[PDB]
Amino acid sequence: GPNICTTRGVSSCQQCLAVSPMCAWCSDEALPLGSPRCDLKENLLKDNCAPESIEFPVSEARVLEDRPLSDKGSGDSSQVTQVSPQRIALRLRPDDSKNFSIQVRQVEDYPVDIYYLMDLSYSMKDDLWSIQNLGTKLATQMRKLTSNLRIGFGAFVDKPVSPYMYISPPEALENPCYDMKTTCLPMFGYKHVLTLTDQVTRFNEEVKKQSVSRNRDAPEGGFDAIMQATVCDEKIGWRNDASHLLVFTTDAKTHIALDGRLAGIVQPNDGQCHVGSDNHYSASTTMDYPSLGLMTEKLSQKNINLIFAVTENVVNLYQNYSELIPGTTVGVLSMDSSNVLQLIVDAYGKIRSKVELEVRDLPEELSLSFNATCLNNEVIPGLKSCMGLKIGDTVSFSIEAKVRGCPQEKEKSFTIKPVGFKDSLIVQVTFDCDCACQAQAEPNSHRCNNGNGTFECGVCRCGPGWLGSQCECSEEDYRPSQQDECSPREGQPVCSQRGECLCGQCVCHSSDFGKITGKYCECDDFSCVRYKGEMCSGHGQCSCGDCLCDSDWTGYYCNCTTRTDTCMSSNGLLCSGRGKCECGSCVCIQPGSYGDTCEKCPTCPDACTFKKECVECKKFDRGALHDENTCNRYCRDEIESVKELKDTGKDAVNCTYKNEDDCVVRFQYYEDSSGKSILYVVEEPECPKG
Amino acid sequence: FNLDVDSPAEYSGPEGSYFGFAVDFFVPSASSRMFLLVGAPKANTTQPGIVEGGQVLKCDWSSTRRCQPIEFDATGNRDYAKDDPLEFKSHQWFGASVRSKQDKILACAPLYHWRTEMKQEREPVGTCFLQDGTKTVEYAPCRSQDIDADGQGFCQGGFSIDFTKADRVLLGGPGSFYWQGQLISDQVAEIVSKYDPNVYSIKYNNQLATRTAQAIFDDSYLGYSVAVGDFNGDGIDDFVSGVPRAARTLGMVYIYDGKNMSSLYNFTGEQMAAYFGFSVAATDINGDDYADVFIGAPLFMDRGSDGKLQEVGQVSVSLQRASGDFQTTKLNGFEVFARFGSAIAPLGDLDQDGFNDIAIAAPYGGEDKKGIVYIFNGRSTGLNAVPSQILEGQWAARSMPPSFGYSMKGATDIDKNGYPDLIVGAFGVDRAILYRARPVITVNAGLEVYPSILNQDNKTCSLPGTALKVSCFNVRFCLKADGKGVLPRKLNFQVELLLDKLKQKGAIRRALFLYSRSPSHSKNMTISRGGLMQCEELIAYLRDESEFRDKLTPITIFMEYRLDYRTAADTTGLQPILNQFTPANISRQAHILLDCGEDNVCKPKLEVSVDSDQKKIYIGDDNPLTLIVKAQNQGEGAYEAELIVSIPLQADFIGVVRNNEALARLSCAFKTENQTRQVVCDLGNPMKAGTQLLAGLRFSVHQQSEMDTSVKFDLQIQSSNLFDKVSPVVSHKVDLAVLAAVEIRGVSSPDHVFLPIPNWEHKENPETEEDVGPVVQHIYELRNNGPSSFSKAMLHLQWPYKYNNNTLLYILHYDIDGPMNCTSDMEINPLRIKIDIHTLGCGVAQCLKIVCQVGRLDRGKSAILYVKSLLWTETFMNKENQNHSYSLKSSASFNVIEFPYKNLPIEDITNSTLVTTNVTWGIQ
Amino acid sequence: CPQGRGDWAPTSCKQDSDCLAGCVCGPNGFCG
Numbered sequence A: 001g002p003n004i005c006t007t008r009g010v011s012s013c014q015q016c017l018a019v020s021p022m023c024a025w026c027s028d029e030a031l032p033l034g035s036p037r038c039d040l041k042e043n044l045l046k047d048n049c050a051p052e053s054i055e056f057p058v059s060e061a062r063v064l065e066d067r068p069l070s071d072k073g074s075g076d077s078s079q080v081t082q083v084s085p086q087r088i089a090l091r092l093r094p095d096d097s098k099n100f101s102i103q104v105r106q107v108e109d110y111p112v113d114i115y116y117l118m119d120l121s122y123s124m125k126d127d128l129w130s131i132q133n134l135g136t137k138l139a140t141q142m143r144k145l146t147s148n149l150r151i152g153f154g155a156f157v158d159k160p161v162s163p164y165m166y167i168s169p170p171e172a173l174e175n176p177c178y179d180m181k182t183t184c185l186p187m188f189g190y191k192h193v194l195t196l197t198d199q200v201t202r203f204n205e206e207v208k209k210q211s212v213s214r215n216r217d218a219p220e221g222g223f224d225a226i227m228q229a230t231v232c233d234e235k236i237g238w239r240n241d242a243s244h245l246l247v248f249t250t251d252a253k254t255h256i257a258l259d260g261r262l263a264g265i266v267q268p269n270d271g272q273c274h275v276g277s278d279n280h281y282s283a284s285t286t287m288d289y290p291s292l293g294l295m296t297e298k299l300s301q302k303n304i305n306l307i308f309a310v311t312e313n314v315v316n317l318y319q320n321y322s323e324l325i326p327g328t329t330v331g332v333l334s335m336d337s338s339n340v341l342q343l344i345v346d347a348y349g350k351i352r353s354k355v356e357l358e359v360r361d362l363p364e365e366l367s368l369s370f371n372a373t374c375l376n377n378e379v380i381p382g383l384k385s386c387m388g389l390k391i392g393d394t395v396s397f398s399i400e401a402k403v404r405g406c407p408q409e410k411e412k413s414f415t416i417k418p419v420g421f422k423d424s425l426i427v428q429v430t431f432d433c434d435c436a437c438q439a440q441a442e443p444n445s446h447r448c449n450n451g452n453g454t455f456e457c458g459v460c461r462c463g464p465g466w467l468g469s470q471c472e473c474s475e476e477d478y479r480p481s482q483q484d485e486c487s488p489r490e491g492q493p494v495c496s497q498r499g500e501c502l503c504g505q506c507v508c509h510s511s512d513f514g515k516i517t518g519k520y521c522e523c524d525d526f527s528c529v530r531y532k533g534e535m536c537s538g539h540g541q542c543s544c545g546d547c548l549c550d551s552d553w554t555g556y557y558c559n560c561t562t563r564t565d566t567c568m569s570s571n572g573l574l575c576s577g578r579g580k581c582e583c584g585s586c587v588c589i590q591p592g593s594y595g596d597t598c599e600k601c602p603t604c605p606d607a608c609t610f611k612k613e614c615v616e617c618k619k620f621d622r623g624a625l626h627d628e629n630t631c632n633r634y635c636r637d638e639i640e641s642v643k644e645l646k647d648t649g650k651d652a653v654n655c656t657y658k659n660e661d662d663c664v665v666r667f668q669y670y671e672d673s674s675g676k677s678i679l680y681v682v683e684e685p686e687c688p689k690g
Numbered sequence B: 001f002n003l004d005v006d007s008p009a010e011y012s013g014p015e016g017s018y019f020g021f022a023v024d025f026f027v028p029s030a031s032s033r034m035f036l037l038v039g040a041p042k043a044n045t046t047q048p049g050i051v052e053g054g055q056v057l058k059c060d061w062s063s064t065r066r067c068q069p070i071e072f073d074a075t076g077n078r079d080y081a082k083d084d085p086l087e088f089k090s091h092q093w094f095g096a097s098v099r100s101k102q103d104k105i106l107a108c109a110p111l112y113h114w115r116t117e118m119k120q121e122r123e124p125v126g127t128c129f130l131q132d133g134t135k136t137v138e139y140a141p142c143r144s145q146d147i148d149a150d151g152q153g154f155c156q157g158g159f160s161i162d163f164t165k166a167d168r169v170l171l172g173g174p175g176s177f178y179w180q181g182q183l184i185s186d187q188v189a190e191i192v193s194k195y196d197p198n199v200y201s202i203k204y205n206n207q208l209a210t211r212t213a214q215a216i217f218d219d220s221y222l223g224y225s226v227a228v229g230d231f232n233g234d235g236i237d238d239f240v241s242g243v244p245r246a247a248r249t250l251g252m253v254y255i256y257d258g259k260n261m262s263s264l265y266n267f268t269g270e271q272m273a274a275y276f277g278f279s280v281a282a283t284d285i286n287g288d289d290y291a292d293v294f295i296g297a298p299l300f301m302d303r304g305s306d307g308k309l310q311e312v313g314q315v316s317v318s319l320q321r322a323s324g325d326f327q328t329t330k331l332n333g334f335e336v337f338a339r340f341g342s343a344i345a346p347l348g349d350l351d352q353d354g355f356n357d358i359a360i361a362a363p364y365g366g367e368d369k370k371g372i373v374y375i376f377n378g379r380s381t382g383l384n385a386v387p388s389q390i391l392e393g394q395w396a397a398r399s400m401p402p403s404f405g406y407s408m409k410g411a412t413d414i415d416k417n418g419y420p421d422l423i424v425g426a427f428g429v430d431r432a433i434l435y436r437a438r439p440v441i442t443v444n445a446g447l448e449v450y451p452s453i454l455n456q457d458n459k460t461c462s463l464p465g466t467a468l469k470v471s472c473f474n475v476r477f478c479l480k481a482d483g484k485g486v487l488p489r490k491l492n493f494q495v496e497l498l499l500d501k502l503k504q505k506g507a508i509r510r511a512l513f514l515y516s517r518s519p520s521h522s523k524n525m526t527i528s529r530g531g532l533m534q535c536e537e538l539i540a541y542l543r544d545e546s547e548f549r550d551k552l553t554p555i556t557i558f559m560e561y562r563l564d565y566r567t568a569a570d571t572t573g574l575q576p577i578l579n580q581f582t583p584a585n586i587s588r589q590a591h592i593l594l595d596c597g598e599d600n601v602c603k604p605k606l607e608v609s610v611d612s613d614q615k616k617i618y619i620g621d622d623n624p625l626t627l628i629v630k631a632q633n634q635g636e637g638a639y640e641a642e643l644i645v646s647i648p649l650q651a652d653f654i655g656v657v658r659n660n661e662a663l664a665r666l667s668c669a670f671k672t673e674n675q676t677r678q679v680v681c682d683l684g685n686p687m688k689a690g691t692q693l694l695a696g697l698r699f700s701v702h703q704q705s706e707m708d709t710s711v712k713f714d715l716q717i718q719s720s721n722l723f724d725k726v727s728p729v730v731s732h733k734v735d736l737a738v739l740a741a742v743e744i745r746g747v748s749s750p751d752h753v754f755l756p757i758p759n760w761e762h763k764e765n766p767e768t769e770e771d772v773g774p775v776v777q778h779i780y781e782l783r784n785n786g787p788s789s790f791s792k793a794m795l796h797l798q799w800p801y802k803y804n805n806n807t808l809l810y811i812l813h814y815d816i817d818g819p820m821n822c823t824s825d826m827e828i829n830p831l832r833i834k835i836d837i838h839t840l841g842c843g844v845a846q847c848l849k850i851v852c853q854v855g856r857l858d859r860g861k862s863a864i865l866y867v868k869s870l871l872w873t874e875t876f877m878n879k880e881n882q883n884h885s886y887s888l889k890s891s892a893s894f895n896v897i898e899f900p901y902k903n904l905p906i907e908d909i910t911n912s913t914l915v916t917t918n919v920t921w922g923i924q
Numbered sequence C: 001c002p003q004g005r006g007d008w009a010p011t012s013c014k015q016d017s018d019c020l021a022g023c024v025c026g027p028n029g030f031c032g
């Protein structure tokens, strides 16, 4: 039986298990010579080592908790549960993998929390209409998506130091509007006003008192307020098992980290809570602004969603900022648009429109693969995110966990989690690296040797450099090494030169750069393969001529990533829906489509072609998207029958087509005016006459 | 890599004074000594009424680490009236900027506040102080009569400062003009010659200064950082400044001329909020006498292994060329939240290799947030991205982060040992540390062994103790050293020799030293600097012909040498260090005489041959090329046989083929030495007679010059034998080919028009589009997908203008996207219009032709023609057989006429496509 | 058409009386 187990595992039980997940070992002394010890279970079964003498662990993933997915967010009976299972126990062998799966559901009537950061600087004087009767305008539009709503709010101006603060005439310390001979309020860094409550009564009254303050420079640094409202959850009132929305409303641009050096502020933000009993940021004057990275980390740990409620003059700005804090939404604040009272509920749709998985505390040895089943059993490899969802949908992720080699340590515990939700799948990973052979041995001393022999897992291992099979494999004899063994077939040189067979066991360990092992000395430990001048592309360790890719890398050379971010396009769908993602680069598979994300396709048919498929499945219960059940996921554009179609000379794109009933359907779609793509259909298609 | 890390000179100052916030060297011209300048912008002073005025200390390097305040100003606040201070020095951060030319010491106080002479205010204009040993002046170019956020009231000048070669001061202040920022440059002589202690707002002649701009530039913070260097023809240093809030928070870096503050060049960040331009540094890193720009973005978020944003920080290396152009590369941090680009400090030539070096600092990185400083060595290619040394902070946090590395100054050899040194500050722990450069030593070792081919029958040497007359040979080993800078003239190494290094793993060592009887030997050699390759001798011998094991494995003789690191610079023992990239050991091989014939010598016949299996490769692509090599030895044994595959400029090596058993897994490696890169492959030591090796070598070729016509390899086996030790050279040629998979694609939008048309009424003389009909748009695309490019091609469009003297698709306008000029043989838009089935295909219709001239399309470039036409409705509502369906057919063809690659078998590419617009009747 | 720098806000629209030139008025009564 010349297999991989019989080759690299004949040393001991420890190194036999590490050869392949398919190897077995024979502990007992049943025929302890002339027979292989690391062969498979079945080849160790015929040659009978059948009893507990066989050391053969198997990898497994046991589920320790899986509560059923809840139907509603009202905690009537037990609690809310949006992920199943909850605790898997992973038991892993060296170089082995074991796949499992997880289901995620955005339940309905989920309790929502809304904290409101108000810019109270002077620029906002012309912008405080929004805060007026807010709790009514938060309740009157969120009730449709949830009961059990809580609201609170705070305010921020800027750091109360120079060069931001008006300190110069003493009467400007208490009235920054000393000039203009007006009256406004003293400035403050961040003021917590109202803890999250359920009474819009006390809210609307507490909001109407608010008036503006004044400082010098147009940046206002609410990022100090964002951080404190995130990590002071005890003071803010963030509830467990509730959507957390942090709404940020401001007039102009914002200070960023390192700006405070102009103020003599050179201490980085520590991300800790510093609001005390006075409800004031006690380190506003001593601590720099927070960096985007620190905000993102804390915004994700505390499962907070940041909403940017900003004005037209500055919308492009935070829109560009939001791309750096993934999962944040922007929204215009002006009555010159369709919906301003629906501003937050429009955003909460976007937040819940996707489910992306995140990993915490992943052991460095482990590497996770991800399939994604987002719609109707349509498995998508390499995706840990499903998009286009609505509140209520349910998605499934299939997960693989593989370890390279195996670490010797206690059991670790990492978390697989939906972004922005309390519910999590905790994976207790234990590594079955060693056999039950070391403890079961006699002491390592006084055994088969003249002085200090150490053995008794399976074989005699006596002395250094000699290690006799019985004992004392010695210097030049021409004894048992007769080229019978020490050569895979006796028509070949001895032990794969780079080594000569002295006794039965050839120590071929001629000191090449790196290391050398293998019974017949065939293993390399280097010279695996090179993509650039680096072996395994620098992303993989070399094991007997084979590249063991590091986490997030695959391929014979370990030069192909698992990333899909470079594959994503601006619209959100990967490769713009016209290509496959392979090695982090879109391979566009579609006629006449090209570009990094297949965004360019001037030969592709006009949108009049796919949008008509949504007209047929939503309005006529007909077409191809109806057969594949994809109409409710793909057709999210609101369609309306509009009674002899409207038209303005303001970029209305008109489309027509002829259905199965020989009737000419006519429709136009007003391209995104508020991001919304609305679709207008004429009733009474042109049908023939009798 | 040569900074001494175990004997650093540590200086400390007052607690909570931010001692170490800024550092520089003091090299007075009236003293052979040198000093450390360290600012403490929060140190307390004897100035009356001034809480935390700040100091600048000079520190004696001799010994005892004494730091004493320089007295720039001992006075309190000047007064505007009886009890109405004119200035406020309390909490002014004096010393946050410190620069020193020869004897001038410029220190600044960027938070220095001022009560204007107009209204009671506190405006942080910032001040400076220039000391010339005896005379001390005040430089406050932002204390003008232009006072407010509107003007210079908040300029905070001296936030960043620097000197030029001609004693010009460059000063930055990021608060001028509603925080647009400002650069102000003044000659040093004018600063002292114009100083007037009774005048608060002094005008300096020859002042260079930026001016306020449009309000769009507010809050950009120009002057956050400054550096100087020449980026023009003149010898005059030009002005580099960081403006990290500029450009919608992308950040930018402005380069101004040194003569007249003219704008020269601009760098723009790639990522918002990253603080591109937090720091700048100018130095010549590639030894081309052209200053290079280094921009730091310490909050840069790059993509981790999983594609997730992580704040690691990024330093931008921009190499100046003969033209204005800059070759710019990027260099990312290593630990998250470490703030990698915080401080960038030129080192001069830390190793004296001939190329200048630089140090970048991640002051919040390291273990326990102690700080890290990475040393990067320059080379001819530019900066080497892999750091050669890591300076790790020693001090732990007390109240705030140590910030070790927040400030750094190099480029000055304070020990006068020939190598520059390096100060590093940590204002969180109130310390500053000076690292001294070690002297680099380049040692070349030789090892030669008398006859490599040992005959056991030939025993012409006696043996001590027993006189058996055994076979012997000699081992000679040479050692020479040389090193720049100060260095002891004689060095003491510890050389060690090992016989048969492949053995000693428990096998039998087959050679022993004669007198010592052992395979190991040691000796203390002592050499002098220079050349003079001083050698030594020893006598080793072989065991008995019937004693050890075997005769094919060769005797590897191993020499290693280690330098005893005493013999140091006598100053706390500044011990030297060996050159970084040098082998600390060399080894040669001796063979046993065996199967060499009666001539007593092995004379091989070496042959090499190779076939193509592809015979042609295409230009634009990266082609897999596998050469099948046959290396056979039909003569006597070949000691240390290796296959030498000399690859050309274009291609490189991938790996050996192991997917097939008919070929061999030869160990191969990519070598570069001595002006020629090549591939070596071990054929066996020895390569026995009649040995026929066969394997394949995978490659990847990319054409170098667009007119090359071929790729030639050269194959040769060579061996360490004395006679007949090389094979004939075999040159294999692979021919470059041209392949341009070009295709033309078309589409109509829409592709159907339904009749009748809504709100359509026949106008007498049609004027707009609504009076004519709907918009039919034909889009034609010519895309080159194949590897090879082309230089010229033609494109012809056939268009159905008329049928029976009746317009069909009235072309309004045609646009082009790409390298293409089009011309229509009939005037487009004669009427000046503002903003079964029957096929009509220009073979039965009046054809309007459009001819386009396509330029160079590369591997993935397209050329597109957009034809916006109107449906002539007046036609289709007539005895033009209304209720009859028509298919308006247009076609387009192309012919590729020219390719940039000459001397090559180009063959033409023609193809065509057709686009239809089916106008038909949906109802009667 | 006009604007201001810093923590700026249009003063108050009693248009045709208060603001010298301005370029807009409307809700909540603010100038251009």
Ligand SMILES: *[C@@H]1O[C@H](CO)[C@@H](O[C@@H]2O[C@H](CO)[C@@H](O[C@@H]3O[C@H](CO[C@@H]4O[C@H](CO)[C@@H](O[C@H]5O[C@H](CO)[C@@H](O)[C@H](O)[C@@H]5O)[C@H](O)[C@@H]4O)[C@@H](O)[C@H](O[C@H]4O[C@H](CO)[C@@H](O)[C@H](O)[C@@H]4O)[C@@H]3O)[C@H](O)[C@H]2NC(C)=O)[C@H](O)[C@H]1NC(C)=O
Pocket: B212, B213, B214, B215, B217, B263, B264, B265, B266
């Ligand atoms: C590196 O990047 C830097 C930053 O992007 C570049 O610096 C910028 O370069 C621009 C190009 O030179 C330059 O724009 C020019 O600005 C001057 C400023 O003079 C003005 O004078 C008037 C009163 O003082 C005011 O202009 C009127 O118009 C503005 C709107 O622009 C109104 O809002 C005002 O009320 C006012 O009525 C300004 O306040 C300003 O002080 C202009 O004169 C120039 O005019 C030129 O272009 C126009 C076309 O629109 C022509 O008609 C005219 O004859 C000139 O050719 C430019 O607008 C920026 O000021 C400058 N910014 C900074 C901070 O340096 C830099 O050039 C670049 N370098 C390189 C090498 O790439």
Ligand SMILES: *[C@@H]1O[C@H](CO)[C@@H](O[C@@H]2O[C@H](CO)[C@@H](O[C@@H]3O[C@H](CO)[C@@H](O)[C@H](O[C@H]4O[C@H](CO)[C@@H](O)[C@H](O)[C@@H]4O)[C@@H]3O)[C@H](O)[C@H]2NC(C)=O)[C@H](O)[C@H]1NC(C)=O
Pocket: B014, B015, B016, B017, B042, B043, B044, B051, B052
């Ligand atoms: C330079 O000299 C100035 C001289 O004034 C010196 O400034 C002083 O620093 C001390 C710090 O040691 C300040 O003392 C503080 O006073 C405030 C009230 O004014 C207290 O609140 C401070 O904290 C106390 O209370 C806290 C909670 O209630 C406790 O946690 C804490 O342990 C204290 O008991 C503290 O006592 C003093 O106000 C200033 N004076 C000024 C600024 O005028 C400065 O430190 C010196 N700097 C250097 C580098 O030597």
Ligand SMILES: *[C@@H]1O[C@H](CO)[C@@H](O[C@@H]2O[C@H](CO)[C@@H](O[C@@H]3O[C@H](CO)[C@@H](O)[C@H](O[C@H]4O[C@H](CO)[C@@H](O)[C@H](O)[C@@H]4O)[C@@H]3O)[C@H](O)[C@H]2NC(C)=O)[C@H](O)[C@H]1NC(C)=O
Pocket: B450, B451, B455, B458, B459, B460, B461, B471, B472, B473, B474
């Ligand atoms: C049998 O084995 C013995 C082994 O001892 C061998 O005798 C040795 O041969 C070597 C070389 O084969 C001889 O040493 C030489 O000495 C002369 C000076 O008299 C040198 O010219 C030789 O070449 C060197 O020349 C320069 C020195 O002047 C060097 O710069 C150069 O690099 C060369 O090294 C060489 O050193 C000598 O005959 C002995 N030496 C010893 C130590 O025994 C004998 O040749 C073998 N015979 C057969 C038939 O196998």
Ligand SMILES: *[C@@H]1O[C@H](CO)[C@@H](O[C@@H]2O[C@H](CO)[C@@H](O[C@@H]3O[C@H](CO)[C@@H](O)[C@H](O)[C@@H]3O)[C@H](O)[C@H]2NC(C)=O)[C@H](O)[C@H]1NC(C)=O
Pocket: A531, A557, A559, A560, A561, A583, B621, B622, B623, B624, B654, B698
């Ligand atoms: C990792 O490295 C390997 C090897 O260097 C890369 O594979 C090489 O590139 C492509 C992979 O699909 C293969 O295709 C070859 O190029 C032309 C281009 O038109 C193609 O049409 C042919 O099929 C041709 O075979 C190429 O053969 C392959 N080479 C080898 C030796 O396998 C791989 O792309 C690298 N991956 C990354 C992400 O860099």
Ligand SMILES: *[C@@H]1O[C@H](CO)[C@@H](O[C@@H]2O[C@H](CO)[C@@H](O)[C@H](O)[C@H]2NC(C)=O)[C@H](O)[C@H]1NC(C)=O
Pocket: A099, A100, A369, A370, A371, A380, A381, A382, A398, A399, A400
């Ligand atoms: C992830 O998706 C792939 C998509 O094919 C699943 O299929 C495996 O694909 C790779 C290589 O083709 C291998 O793991 C197996 O050959 C495939 N397994 C099959 C077909 O059962 C893969 O199983 C998925 N993994 C997880 C953990 O869901």
Ligand SMILES: *[C@@H]1O[C@H](CO)[C@@H](O[C@@H]2O[C@H](CO)[C@@H](O)[C@H](O)[C@H]2NC(C)=O)[C@H](O)[C@H]1NC(C)=O
Pocket: B257, B259, B260, B262, B263
């Ligand atoms: C400031 O100095 C620079 C160089 O010393 C001048 O740049 C040249 O000016 C002349 C005349 O205006 C032009 O013909 C050249 O093309 C300029 N050289 C360039 C742009 O590289 C500049 O004119 C000087 N004066 C200013 C900027 O006002």
Ligand SMILES: *[C@@H]1O[C@H](CO)[C@@H](O[C@@H]2O[C@H](CO)[C@@H](O)[C@H](O)[C@H]2NC(C)=O)[C@H](O)[C@H]1NC(C)=O
Pocket: A513, B560, B583, B584, B585
């Ligand atoms: C002996 O020489 C070898 C080879 O020159 C060196 O050991 C390693 O060599 C590889 C390949 O050049 C390097 O990548 C390693 O970094 C070297 N090891 C070390 C520790 O640096 C080295 O010069 C010598 N090694 C010994 C143990 O004597």
Ligand SMILES: *[C@@H]1O[C@H](CO)[C@@H](O[C@@H]2O[C@H](CO)[C@@H](O)[C@H](O)[C@H]2NC(C)=O)[C@H](O)[C@H]1NC(C)=O
Pocket: B910, B911, B912
């Ligand atoms: C022109 O383009 C056509 C695509 O319409 C291609 O024709 C292919 O090549 C030959 C010629 O008919 C056939 O073997 C293939 O089956 C064709 N494919 C088709 C018709 O789909 C080809 O790229 C070009 N052909 C010529 C003759 O120029």
Ligand SMILES: *[C@@H]1O[C@H](CO)[C@@H](O[C@@H]2O[C@H](CO)[C@@H](O)[C@H](O)[C@H]2NC(C)=O)[C@H](O)[C@H]1NC(C)=O
Pocket: B751, B837, B887, B916, B917, B918
């Ligand atoms: C527009 O009309 C033409 C001519 O009738 C259509 O061309 C048809 O294409 C099919 C292949 O799909 C071929 O059998 C013939 O060339 C045409 N059909 C018949 C029955 O003659 C063309 O498909 C029409 N356009 C669209 C969008 O359907």
Ligand SMILES: *[C@@H]1O[C@H](CO)[C@@H](O)[C@H](O)[C@H]1NC(C)=O
Pocket: A316, A317, A320, B248
């Ligand atoms: C936002 O980003 C876009 C490109 O992503 C850019 O064109 C635009 O100018 C940016 N605007 C702001 C205000 O950052």
Ligand SMILES: *[C@@H]1O[C@H](CO)[C@@H](O)[C@H](O)[C@H]1NC(C)=O
Pocket: B523, B524, B564
């Ligand atoms: C070599 O040097 C070491 C230490 O410097 C010393 O112990 C040894 O005796 C020396 N040997 C000779 C031969 O000089």
Ligand SMILES: *[C@@H]1O[C@H](CO)[C@@H](O)[C@H](O)[C@H]1NC(C)=O
Pocket: B819, B820, B821, B853, B854, B855
């Ligand atoms: C198109 O015309 C312009 C000027 O008429 C010329 O510079 C350009 O080279 C032309 N391009 C081609 C592809 O003929």
Ligand SMILES: [Mn+2]
Pocket: A123, A124, A125, A126, A127, A251, C008, C009
């Ligand atoms: Mn406003």
Ligand SMILES: [Mn+2]
Pocket: A157, A158, A164, A215, A216, A217, A218, A219, A220, A221
């Ligand atoms: Mn402000």
Ligand SMILES: [Mn+2]
Pocket: B229, B230, B231, B232, B233, B234, B235, B236, B237, B238, B257, B258, B259
């Ligand atoms: Mn210059």
Ligand SMILES: [Mn+2]
Pocket: B283, B284, B285, B286, B287, B288, B289, B290, B291, B292, B319, B320
């Ligand atoms: Mn240079």
